Design a protein around this ligand. Sequence first.
Ligand SMILES: *[C@@H]1O[C@H](CO)[C@@H](O[C@@H]2O[C@H](CO)[C@@H](O[C@@H]3O[C@H](CO)[C@@H](O)[C@H](O)[C@@H]3O)[C@H](O)[C@H]2NC(C)=O)[C@H](O)[C@H]1NC(C)=O
Ligand SMILES: *[C@@H]1O[C@H](CO)[C@@H](O[C@@H]2O[C@H](CO)[C@@H](O[C@@H]3O[C@H](CO)[C@@H](O)[C@H](O)[C@@H]3O)[C@H](O)[C@H]2NC(C)=O)[C@H](O)[C@H]1NC(C)=O
Lengths: 122, 122
Amino acid sequence: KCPKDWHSHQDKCFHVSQTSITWKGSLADCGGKGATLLLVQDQEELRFLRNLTKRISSSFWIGLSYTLSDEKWKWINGSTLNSDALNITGDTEKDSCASVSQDKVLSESCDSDNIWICQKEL
Amino acid sequence: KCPKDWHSHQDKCFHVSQTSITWKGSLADCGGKGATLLLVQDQEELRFLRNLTKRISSSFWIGLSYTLSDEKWKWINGSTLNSDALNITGDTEKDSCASVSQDKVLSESCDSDNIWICQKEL
Ligand SMILES: *[C@@H]1O[C@H](CO)[C@@H](O[C@@H]2O[C@H](CO)[C@@H](O[C@@H]3O[C@H](CO)[C@@H](O)[C@H](O)[C@@H]3O)[C@H](O)[C@H]2NC(C)=O)[C@H](O)[C@H]1NC(C)=O
Ligand SMILES: *[C@@H]1O[C@H](CO)[C@@H](O[C@@H]2O[C@H](CO)[C@@H](O[C@@H]3O[C@H](CO)[C@@H](O)[C@H](O)[C@@H]3O)[C@H](O)[C@H]2NC(C)=O)[C@H](O)[C@H]1NC(C)=O
């Protein structure tokens, strides 16, 4: 199904942003649409979105972050990141937030501006 | 099922906040938990949460707002509000946001601070 201007794929709907924003701003944005940032299901899904976002270049925020007090990478669903379901690359001496480039997954400052993608589940 | 410190009810899990915040801050908060603000299902559900939040008093933000350029009340899922599935009370000369008190549902400035509740669906 999905709504107008969102792209369907398996049991999920995606909306790619038209602007770039901080990680926390992107949380508020997908929140106002009754959605969340991305919980990556497969390397298949990561392929599909990498294509969809090819034209935009940029690298898009996902629902995955590192808070220094936790001492670990965590998806917004509460699960710890599996390092070889998905391999994040970059430093972690501060709170960081993950984005997905064409070739990598990046630890970045949560105050960087990136494109984001929102998901809703059918 | 649900996770630790969330309350189950029908097919939904709820978490009540421990602080009070603006509407947009609450969007970011439930976003970081892979959740959304409340989409009220029944007057049954509004009863259950009004009890759960009885001890906090206060009035909790929900996933419903009015943006002046739209000219109508809309849930975060995109649907327009049915005024007698749920009746909102208060003015609308500016963008507003809805909270649920013990007796009413209130139009408020989106910059007010309220308690909020996040929902995940099983
Ligand atoms: C929190 O979100 C993360 C990211 O979506 C979830 O991680 C994903 O969990 C699924 C389901 O358990 C994993 O899929 C599995 O793949 C193997 C095939 O190799 C198969 O044996 C299983 O039947 C299943 O399909 C998936 O790999 C995994 N993705 C990543 C990137 O780690 C996590 O489950 C979520 N937490 C929940 C739903 O509580
Ligand atoms: C967007 O969210 C709102 C708030 O959750 C949804 O409104 C709710 O929609 C449901 C399902 O259509 C309504 O329930 C219906 O109740 C009558 C009994 O009077 C029954 O005939 C139907 O079988 C159904 O159970 C519910 O009243 C309604 N709640 C409110 C407060 O309006 C709306 O559906 C959501 N949009 C979606 C899912 O796209």
